[PDB]
């Protein structure tokens, strides 16, 4: 490797010395230094393994991947957190999966519906409770289009059968009632919750409009895997529609049951979050013959590559329209680079997020002249580390499912100028004196997708990195 790669390999050794022997040898396979000549990780990194016990992992659970990530955003369906009170309460309106609608009337995403298990439900089961629950929902929330049952840990453990309830209630209401077995003890992270959720979509939602008329056009697409964080999906859809495409569905940020049911009639599925929705894209390819392609709308280099590749799947009218759209926003891109690139270039960044963003935002940082010196994921799989490899400079630290301890030790030693990570990391690193941006919630700003997002992104990196407070951590007599 180069002198950075060597420094990083000795840093790895120095950080893992604290772990007990079992753990230490296991955690060594979850880090590596990048080599621009390698196209797949091979044996250099393992991932999607069970978390070491007691290390203070950042990971969440299957319910978080399914209720929190995939189903939660669908605004026209009421989603029931089925179990004890805690889960739906902690996850109530914490993710900024934006939508428009009349809350509690035609849109239900910020309400927390729950069966609130008491001890009696544990002992006698919660199926009669769930069936009565759904009847009370239909009376009080008549405009739902559909209802989802998100299982919390105890549901599978006490032997309940939610598929029987859903079936019986769906006949009774005459609306889809969808059962999800996303108990938090399954899998190792949010990742299996994604997989479970796509598999439910496959069986309970996606075939619902099979055989039925739909007026199609040649330019029909679906946005797959974009949860509209801060309105990211909207800032993306605007460019697709300006290119001449018709966005028939968005999954699932500002997403509806209806749009998902119409997805099988599209001409092309556009996957932003590979990790969470590749499963359903793959299945629609196989069953419906709908091709799919990954794209990246973070930063001007990636947007223009994506617009051209997407347009290339159609014909000359949409290829011309891609060129026009790029040309229309070139003056805004140039003004953003002229204003903010000088304020940020040269600076080093460390990224640590879930399953997509750690690689996907790198071109946007690189358009602002910033360099990524370490990148990790919480719960990505080896195919995600493979897709990260083209975007890393030689000798970059690349890591998986790091403990708080590891992250702290990596930051102390690497001394990034900026860190992008989640709410559980933010306040530790600000106390260390390291500028930090929340790269899951956009630190309550965004969107960061698309041409409109890039402006916000550049403003926000500049705001935090160059804030005048960063010079005051040390008292002047110290």
């Amino acid at each position: 490797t180069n002198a950075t790669g060597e420094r990083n390999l000795a840093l790895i050794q120095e950080v893992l010395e604290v772990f007990p022997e079992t753990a230490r040898k296991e955690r060594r396979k979850h880090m590596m230094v990048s080599d621009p000549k390698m196209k797949s990780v091979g044996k250099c990194i393992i991932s999607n393994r069970k978390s070491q016990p007691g290390v203070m992992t950042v990971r969440g659970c299957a319910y978080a991947g399914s209720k929190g990530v995939v189903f939660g955003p669908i605004k026209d369906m009421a989603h029931i957190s089925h179990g004890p009170v805690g889960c739906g309460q902690y996850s109530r309106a914490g993710r900024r999966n934006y939508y428009t609608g009349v809350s509690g009337v035609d849109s239900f995403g910020t309400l927390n519906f729950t069966s609130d298990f008491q001890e009696r439900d544990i002992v006698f089961g919660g199926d009669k409770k769930l069936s009565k629950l759904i009847e009370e929902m239909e009376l009080l929330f008549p405009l739902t289009k559909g209802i989802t049952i998100q299982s919390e840990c105890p549901v599978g453990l006490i032997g309940d059968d939610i598929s029987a309830v859903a079936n019986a209630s769906s006949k009774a209401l005459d609306k889809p009632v969808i059962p999800v077995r996303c108990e938090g003890f399954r899998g190792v992270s949010q990742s299996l919750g994604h997989h479970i959720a796509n598999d439910v979509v496959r069986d309970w939602i996606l075939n619902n409009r099979e055989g039925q008329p739909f007026e199609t056009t040649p330019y029909d697409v679906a946005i797959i895997g974009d949860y509209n964080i801060g309105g990211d999906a909207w800032a993306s859809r605007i460019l697709l529609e300006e290119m001449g495409l018709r966005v028939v569905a968005q999954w699932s940020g500002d997403g509806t049951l209806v749009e998902m049911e119409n997805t099988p009639f599209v001409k092309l599925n556009l996957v932003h979050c590979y990790r969470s929705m590749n499963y359903i894209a793959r299945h629609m390819e196989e069953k419906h013959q709908i091709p799919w392609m990954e794209y990246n709308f973070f930063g001007p280099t990636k947007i223009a590559e994506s617009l051209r590749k997407i347009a290339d799947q159609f014909d000359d009218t949409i290829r011309a329209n891609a060129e026009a759209v790029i040309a229309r926003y070139e003056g805004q891109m140039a003004a953003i680079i002229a204003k903010y690139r000088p304020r940020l270039e040269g600076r080093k960044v460390l990224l640590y997020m879930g399953g997509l963003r750690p690689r996907h935002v790198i071109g946007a940082y690189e358009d602002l002249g910033m360099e990524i010196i370490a990148a990790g994921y919480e719960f990505a799989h080896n195919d995600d580390y493979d897709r990260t490899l083209p975007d890393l400079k030689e000798g970059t630290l690349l890591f998986d499912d790091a403990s708080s301890y590891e992250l702290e030790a990596f930051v102390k030693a690497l001394k990034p100028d900026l860190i992008g990570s989640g709410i559980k990391e933010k306040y530790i690193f600000q106390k260390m004196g390291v500028p930090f941006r929340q790269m899951h919630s956009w630190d309550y700003s965004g969107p960061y997708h698309g041409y409109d997002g890039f402006a916000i992104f550049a403003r926000d990196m500049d705001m935090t990195l160059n804030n005048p407070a960063w010079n005051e951590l040390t008292a002047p007599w110290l």
């Binding site: 805690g86 309460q89 008491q118 909207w234 859809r237």
Partner: protein, 519 residues
Amino acid sequence: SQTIDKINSCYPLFEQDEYQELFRNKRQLEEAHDAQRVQEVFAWTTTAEYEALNFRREALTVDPAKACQPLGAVLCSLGFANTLPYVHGSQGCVAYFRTYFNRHFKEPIACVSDSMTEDAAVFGGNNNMNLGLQNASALYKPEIIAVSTTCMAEVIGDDLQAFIANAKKDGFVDSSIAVPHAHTPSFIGSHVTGWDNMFEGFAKTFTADYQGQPGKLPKLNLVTGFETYLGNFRVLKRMMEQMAVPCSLLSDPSEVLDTPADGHYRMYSGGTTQQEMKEAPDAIDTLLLQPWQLLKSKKVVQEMWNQPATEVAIPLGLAATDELLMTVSQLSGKPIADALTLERGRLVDMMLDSHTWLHGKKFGLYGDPDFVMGLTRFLLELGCEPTVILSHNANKRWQKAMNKMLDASPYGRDSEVFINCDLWHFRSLMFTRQPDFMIGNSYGKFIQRDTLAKGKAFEVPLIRLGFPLFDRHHLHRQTTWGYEGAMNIVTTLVNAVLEKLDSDTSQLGKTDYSFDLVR
């Protein structure tokens, strides 16, 4: 589109024409109900008819106003010196508990899981525990590992006491590390229950075998219970120092939730020492400052420690602060300090100065049982009417004592107390009883928005007191207890009244005849 000189965030970028059109186009693809139908259904959800249906619920809960036990256990655990909260069970819970406190306190929160997965329903989670305590020790080097449980582990029936004794005997964790434990099932009671069960674990671990003698040390112990205002920990130490009465808070997280941003991360800061907990039985007495949730703690004080557990109400307001201070004076034999008498008289002067704006104002309030009883009491002392009082986690005994207090006051005549009801029930009461204002946590902003949508004449403005507070910053630094805390509550209430009155009279040429300079 964006202009370089004035970049707009999500609001208000999505107000621009291009996005309003994008939304118009997307709606044709959702098979949206007619706007008129939606408005009809909104209007219906604001009626008494709907409220009657809503109050017939027996199975569905909508927008609960409580959390689960282990959250409480984690908070109790953070209040002890060099302690690492550890939750035996599934790791999803611990991500959520850390997040929830991160967003309320704006601070880092250390908690660990042992990541129990499908392998433990059949095998038990002893292996998880063994390795979890070994790794947590090695990485974080605690002196105490405070063990609570997630609902998976509760259903499973894992025997913490056994697993912990097997971990030390096999050497996973060192024997000089203290490992208090508590079962904290989420399908019983709420986060306040978890705090109290965790406190009973600490007291068992540090005092089980001690030959105590109340009064051997001339000090008082204080126990706050689940409390998320840093100021309330600080004001109690400050008043006790003024009284000149030695005191220990048992579980005080105020230092570890307020470390400085000085270039270093400190995982552990201040907190109740093991010495303080070990000597706890020799104090004169232990005062339980939130009596409705400190149930098992009361059994510890009385049965294990043989102390009186003198009964004290939550020290929220004038009269309950007076009572706490007379109780400290009676138990210690020391006089109430003159500077406390002076502070008490400045509070009285504030209440006299602001009485005309508060008298007869109607409030809706919700929260935890002790908080809601204490704030109701003080609202009655100010001549305000708590017309709608709700506590999702409160019981029938608490409800009976509430109605007793209310029936005794001139100001409680139109008051209605609700237990085991949620914020969707609270939303219907705001529309049918329409108080002037509501007191609650950030989840009440959604009710404010709903009452404003019915009309400006029906808006019920939220006053933020409680937990969690996520949409404002640094409110967790305030005080709500003692005379200092009562001054904060009086100033907040009267300025909310004057803020609303200014807003309503600020329409140039129409309502601004009453837009007075002086109030």
